[PDB]
Design a protein around this ligand. Structure first.
Ligand SMILES: OC[C@H]1O[C@H](O[C@H]2[C@H](O)[C@@H](O)[C@H](OCCCCCCC3CCCCC3)O[C@@H]2CO)[C@H](O)[C@@H](O)[C@@H]1O
Length: 265
């Protein structure tokens, strides 16, 4: 594999789309690689990690409990609800809803949680409270994946998202138990985690949340490192590419391969 920046460039050439990428030390926030890091990209399903950070912040303040059972109706369900469609009779706890949203990208689970934090506006207000003045959620699932060209709704930047995930996982804004829970939800991703592990060399840690939307939109927020440690946050977004989902996956994986082959920077 070429150097990380060279591979990122090669990925834009091949996809005919924009890639945005930050690689950041988790413990310190050192930025190692930055490409289009201040440009906007649709968050797609990656927003669900920030969503559950807002939920945890409410838990820490005594305004929410992960145990609290939420009951909902079939009319509340939106497209792709693999866990939530099973619990119309018995409901789901707030914590179960976060696990379904993060580890299965259950869309109805995400909307149920979004309601509890004040909707898209509430989540954006939370972002501002933690010092992210750029990321914005405007819509609910699944309209937030529309990724129209030039539309600022439902976007982040690679630098903002990386700084925000660092803040949620490590800055002690959340309690120790809350930080540990958000991390464990990412470790438990069933959508992409096992697949990523199957192609990672032995010894590499992965935790992640991925997303996809229209017009080629794709995202991953991840923790990655050798020696089974969550050494770095890696955020990669793609937008405005006509490429197959397989090719977008292959290009993201190629960026990961360049990081692995040239880790010591
Ligand atoms: O010398 C480094 C390594 O080089 C290869 O590993 C390859 C591996 O066989 C391939 O499967 C992977 O694909 C990359 C898979 C990455 C998966 C997605 C990464 C995510 C994670 C973080 C967010 C961005 C993307 O690349 C590595 C590095 O070339 C060898 O197979 C392995 O024995 C050796 O230890």
């Amino acid at each position: 594999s070429p150097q990380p920046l060279e591979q990122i460039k090669l990925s834009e050439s091949q996809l005919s789309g924009r890639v945005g990428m930050i690689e950041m030390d988790l413990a310190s926030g050192r930025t190692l690689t930055a490409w289009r890091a201040d440009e906007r990209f649709p968050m797609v399903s990656t927003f669900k990690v920030v969503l559950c950070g807002a939920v945890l912040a409410r838990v820490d303040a005594g305004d929410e409990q992960l145990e609290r059972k939420i009951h909902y109706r079939q009319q509340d369900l939106v497209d792709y609800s693999p866990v939530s469609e099973k619990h119309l009779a018995d409901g789901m706890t707030v914590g179960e809803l976060c696990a379904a949203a993060i580890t299965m990208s259950d869309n109805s689970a995400a909307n149920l949680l979004l309601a509890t934090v004040g909707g898209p506006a509430g989540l954006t207000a939370f972002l501002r409270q933690i010092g992210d003045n750029v990321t914005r959620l405007d819509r609910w699932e699944t309209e937030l994946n529309e990724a129209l060209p030039g539309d600022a709704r439902d976007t982040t930047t690679p630098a903002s998202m990386a700084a925000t995930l660092r803040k949620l996982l490590t800055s002690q804004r959340l309690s120790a138990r809350s930080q540990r829970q958000l991390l464990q939800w990412m470790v438990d991703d069933r959508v992409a985690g096992p697949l990523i592990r199957s192609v990672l060399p032995a010894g590499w840690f992965i935790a992640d949340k991925t997303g996809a939307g229209e017009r080629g939109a794709r995202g991953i927020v991840a923790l990655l490192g050798p020696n089974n440690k969550a050494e770095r946050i890696v955020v990669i977004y793609l937008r405005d590419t006509p490429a197959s989902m397989a090719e977008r996956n292959q290009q993201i994986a190629g960026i990961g391969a360049a990081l692995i082959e040239h880790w010591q920077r």
